[PDB]
């Protein structure tokens, strides 16, 4: 239950933040949870998706066990594209059909100088909360 006065509860405004977001907020709302095998290795729950994180699609029309890497992340439409899932036009041309990334599981991440540091702090800021049980 919300107790803070300084944060909303309405439908009229949360949608209005949701469609009129900036872009740096927009990657934060486009995350996908980590897989079961990988949420023990890093013990962290969710990551902001990027261009190389390979993924199987679990809930939707194309369900499960189809590990394929992402190719393009429409932030404007809150939608990723994966180079395995496709749909042909009427022309016979192929185009990528798009899916909303909370219905998507990362099987393997990408690492750089940034993702070693983000996965530090996102894992660090969990077991501090475990130390409150004294």
């Amino acid at each position: 239950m919300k107790f803070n006065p300084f944060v909303t509860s309405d439908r009229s405004k949360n949608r209005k933040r949701h469609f009129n977001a900036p872009s740096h907020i927009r990657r934060k709302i486009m995350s996908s949870p980590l897989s079961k095998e990988l949420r023990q290795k890093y013990n962290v729950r969710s990551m902001p998706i990027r261009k190389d994180d390979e993924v199987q699609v679990v809930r939707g029309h194309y369900k499960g066990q189809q590990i394929g890497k992402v190719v393009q992340v429409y932030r404007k439409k809150y939608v990723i594209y994966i180079e395995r899932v496709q749909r042909e036009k009427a022309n016979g041309t192929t185009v990528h059909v798009g899916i909303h990334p909370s219905k998507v599981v990362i099987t393997r991440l990408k690492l750089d100088k940034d993702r070693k540091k983000i996965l530090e702090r996102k894992a660090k800021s969990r077991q501090v909360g475990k130390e409150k049980g004294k």
Partner: protein, 260 residues
């Protein structure tokens, strides 16, 4: 609509050309050329007696009636019929003033909450609250109140030591302090007899805080508990007593229907 609805400047035609004498807008040009101006009748117009912000919203009830109703709601949770038939499943529960010890107010983790209400056979009410996870009838869904939810019991306490931290997550349940009560919480929606779980330190303070008829209460401090208008309220035991039926006439049960 406070006063403005009249920011459209217009006048009546003033002659019997062939239209009604309603005010018509000025100018030319756009589609709002000679249309209907203000008046309750017209499109884009003012409303009949536009409501005021000083309608008498807030209401007074003098406090001898505010206290008469809070006595008559706590004295309706005592009877099992007035608290089952409100809708609370108190079938399997033990004794209707459920009273637990003062050690319950040390609870600061809600796993200790759920095993409390299960062991008192009172969890079978919260399980009924989960049936009321609907969504609102009508148009409340865009005035941001959505999930209709039946109230469950209340827990009535004093000297909060953590009990509000343990029960405020359980859906559909309430707490209220036994010094600062609420007729809104005790008798929700007019129908009397909300189910309640008490505490030793709360079930004892009411004798100081409302009293008995033998003395005045020492916390409302100038109060006396209401006086019962009837002596014996079980009139089946009254009218089957031989002091009454010594003086009755008779029954008279012949119908004497209409004779042709």
């Amino acid at each position: 609509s406070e006063l403005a609805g009249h920011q459209t400047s217009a006048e009546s035609w003033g002659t019997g050309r062939a239209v009604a004498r309603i005010p018509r807008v000025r100018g030319g040009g756009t589609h709002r050329s000679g249309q209907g101006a203000f008046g309750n009748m017209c499109r884009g117009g003012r409303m009949f007696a536009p409501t005021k912000t000083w309608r008498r919203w807030h209401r007074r009830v003098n406090t001898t009636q505010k206290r008469y109703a809070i006595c008559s709601a706590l004295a309706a949770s005592a009877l099992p019929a007035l608290v089952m038939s409100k809708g609370h499943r108190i079938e399997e529960v033990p004794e209707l003033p459920l009273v637990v010890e003062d050690k319950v107010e040390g609870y600061k983790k809600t796993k200790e909450a759920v095993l409390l209400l299960k062991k008192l056979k009172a969890w079978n009410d919260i399980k009924k609250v989960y049936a009321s996870q609907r969504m609102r009838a009508g148009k409340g869904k865009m005035r941001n109140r959505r999930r209709i939810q039946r109230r469950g019991p209340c827990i009535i306490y004093n000297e909060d030591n953590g009990i509000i931290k343990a029960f405020r997550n359980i859906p559909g349940i309430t707490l209220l302090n036994v010094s600062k009560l609420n007729i809104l919480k005790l008798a929700p929606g007019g129908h009397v007899g909300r189910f309640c779980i008490w505490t030793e330190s709360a079930f004892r303070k009411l004798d100081e805080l409302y009293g008995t008829w033998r003395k005045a209460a020492s916390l409302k401090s100038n109060y006396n508990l209401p006086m019962h208008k009837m002596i014996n309220t079980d009139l089946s035991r009254i009218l089957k007593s031989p002091e009454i039926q010594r003086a009755l006439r008779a029954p008279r049960k012949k119908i004497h229907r209409r004779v042709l």
